[PDB]
């Protein structure tokens, strides 16, 4: 079959927001699949997919590292301003969910950056089984 | 059918040029399709394609943002040293034309950087119609 | 036929290493094909592939440029801290091998950074011949 799924959204709100930023730029993503408002990414794709996250510089320090399902830790989108970090590929389980850790030092500063999260389907698993 | 099109060129001229730079490194692009001398990109591909522009740092300030056909503004290749900015995907119309705006402040300095413009075909629209 | 090959490894050793870093994070690469311990990349893929190298900043100066088979020089993974530099595409010969040049100034400092080398197959040459 052909899952033909693509997904990508852009954030550009005006100024001071009440908290974290949602996404109003629907560029391409009918099913949505991964809500960037909560970051709860439910990926049924099953296959090989191209993921790309935009890394804010923020040289003021702190450690950003997104959790990865099945191992926790695992920085695929690593930002240092059984466990390893990867960027190109994407070892993800069917239905599993990814979550961002954003807490590595309390005494810090207050800020609200912006981030773009795109990720398009490249190839899906076409059975590929052999009894 | 199979449009099988790829296009990408590299710039590396010696030193001071009389103005903007052309491209003499033919890596892979028989049809050419998008003239990087004028930037008039006529894309007949129609489908999903992979585009990648190289961002010069130039921290000296000024705002670089490439125009996008149908809306004007629209920074897909955004560089800040209905309208939104995207990097991974590429919503382009068949025959559409992309153009860069490079004017956001007159009182500035004179310089001539270099830029690499690669972009390879990923998947094309194979009819996909259903009466 | 279907070569179905993917390859990518991650390095994260503890602290001071005796020399260059190997790779213990097997993310996806059964054949291996390109040993990152020596960098001797033997690519039989033959087709179009997506390559991505991670560039360490190292603003302390020096010139890093990976050699390219068939021409020598040719900086595909260029880092300046018949010959041209490209990043997206990948003009590689079947069986040829790529090697990194890491010597552009003797009077320098001693350091041992880390690097991630991923590269996944996109499309292979399916005969495409026409007597």
> Per residue in A40-54, is it b (16+ CB within 10 Å) or e — as a string?
ebebebebbbbbbbb
Order of strands, sheet of C47-53, starting from the edge strand that comes earlier in the sequence:
C25-28, C6-10, C117-124, C47-53
DSSP labels, A43-108: ----EEEEEEE-----TT---EEEE-TTTS---SSEE-------SSS----TT-EEEEE--S-SS-
Q: What angle do CA C76, C67, B59 make, to 5 degrees?
A: 45
Evaluate whether C85 touches B13 at the Cβ level (below 8 Å): no
Q: Please give the backbone phi and psi of residue C9, each rounded to the nearest 5 degrees, phi first.
A: -135, 155
For CA atoms B119, B59, A78, A43, the dihedral sign is: negative
CATH number corresponding to B1-131: 2.60.120.40
Order of strands, sheet of B97-101, starting from the edge strand that comes earlier in the sequence:
B34-35, B40-42, B97-101, B63-67, B78-80
Q: Do C27 and A122 touch (CB under 8 A)?
A: no
Q: What angle do CA A107, A110, A115 make, to 5 degrees?
A: 120
Q: Please give the backbone phi and psi of residue A108, each rounded to the nearest 5 degrees, phi first.
A: -145, -155
Quote the CA–CA distance of C91 and A131 in Å, as a whole number.
Answer: 39
Radius of gyration of chain A (CA): 16
Which residues of chain B make contact with A52, given a CB cutoff of 8 A? 87-88
First to last CA, chain C: 20
Residues 6+ apart with CB under 8 A from A43: A33, A34, A49, A92, A94, A95, A96, A97, A98
DSSP H or E run through C78: strand C78-79
DSSP for residue C69: T
Quote the CA–CA distance of A58 and B46 in Å, as a whole number.
Answer: 38
Evaluate whether C121 touches C28 at the Cβ level (below 8 Å): no
List the one residue out of B115, B98, B80 whose CA is nearest residue B34: B98
Which residues of chain B make contact with C79, given a CB cutoff of 8 A? none
3-class SS of residue C118: strand
3-class SS of residue C45: coil
Quote the CA–CA distance of A126 and A47 in Å, as a whole number.
Answer: 8
Quote the CA–CA distance of B75 and C40 in Å, as a whole number.
Answer: 40
A85 alpha carbon, distance to own chain's centre: 14
Radius of gyration of chain C (CA): 16
Quote the CA–CA distance of A44 and C110 in Å, as a whole number.
Answer: 47
The runs of H, that is alpha helices, within C1-128 are none
Which residues of chain C make contact with B50, given a CB cutoff of 8 A? 88
Q: Please give the backbone phi and psi of residue C32, each rounded to the nearest 5 degrees, phi first.
A: 80, -65
Quote the CA–CA distance of A51 and A64 in Å, as a whole number.
Answer: 18
Evaluate whether C104 touches C63 at the Cβ level (below 8 Å): yes
List the one residue out of A7, A17, A39, A38 whose CA is nearest residue A114: A17
Q: Do B88 and A25 touch (CB under 8 A)?
A: no
Q: Do B8 and C91 touch (CB under 8 A)?
A: no
Q: Do A86 and C10 touch (CB under 8 A)?
A: yes
Quote the CA–CA distance of B18 and B12 in Å, as a whole number.
Answer: 14
A130 alpha carbon, distance to own chain's centre: 33
| Beta pairing partners, A117 | A9, A53
DSSP labels, B95-125: T-EEEEE--S-SS---------EEEEEEEE-
Residues 6+ apart with CB under 8 A from A89: A48, C6, C8, C27, C28, C118, C120
The CA-atom distances, in angstroms, between B112 and each of A122, B12, B102 are: 37, 12, 12
3-class SS of residue A130: coil
List the one residue out of C128, C47, C127 whose CA is nearest residue C93: C47
List the one residue out of B87, B123, C3 whose CA is nearest residue A25: B87
Evaluate whether C23 touches C9 at the Cβ level (below 8 Å): yes
Which residues of chain B make contact with C91, given a CB cutoff of 8 A? 27-28
**Chains touching chain A at 3 or more Cβ pairs under 8 angstroms?**
B, C
Quote the CA–CA distance of C113 and C20 in Å, as a whole number.
Answer: 9
> Per residue in A103-123, is it b (16+ CB within 10 Å) or e — as a string?
eeeeeeeeeeeebbbbbbbbb
Q: Do A119 and B87 touch (CB under 8 A)?
A: no
Which residues of chain A make contact with B122, given a CB cutoff of 8 A? 122
Give the distance between the most distant pair of CA atoms in chain A: 58
- Does B104 contact C at CB distance below 8 Å? no
Q: Do A87 and C25 touch (CB under 8 A)?
A: no
3-class SS of residue C124: strand
Beta pairing class for A47-53 and A117-124: antiparallel
DSSP for residue B46: -
Q: What angle do CA B106, B108, B110 make, to 5 degrees?
A: 110
Residue C19 C-alpha, separation from nearest chain B C-alpha, in angstroms = 32
Quote the CA–CA distance of C91 and C111 in Å, as a whole number.
Answer: 32
Quote the CA–CA distance of C68 and C86 in Å, as a whole number.
Answer: 11
List the one residue out of A13, A10, A82, A94 whose CA is nearest residue A52: A10
B126 alpha carbon, distance to own chain's centre: 24
Evaluate whether B119 touches B34 at the Cβ level (below 8 Å): yes
As a dihedral over the C-alpha atoms of residue C11, residue C12, residue C13, residue C17, rounded to 10 degrees, the angle is 70
- Does A48 contact C at CB distance below 8 Å? yes
Method: NMR
């Amino acid at each position: 079959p052909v899952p033909q799924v693509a997904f990508s959204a852009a954030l550009s709100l005006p100024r001071s927001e009440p908290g974290t930023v949602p996404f109003d730029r629907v560029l391409l993503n009918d099913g949505g699949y991964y809500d960037p408002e909560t970051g709860v990414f439910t990926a049924p794709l099953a296959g090989r997919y191209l993921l790309s996250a935009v890394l804010t510089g923020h040289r003021h320090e702190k450690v950003e590292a997104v959790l990865s399902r099945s191992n926790q830790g695992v920085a695929r989108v690593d930002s240092g301003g059984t466990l390893g970090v990867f960027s190109l590929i994407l070892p993800l389980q069917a239905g599993d969910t990814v979550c961002v850790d954003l807490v590595m030092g309390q005494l810090a500063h207050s800020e609200e950056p912006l981030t773009i999260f795109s990720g398009a389907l490249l190839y899906g698993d076409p059975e590929l089984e052999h009894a």
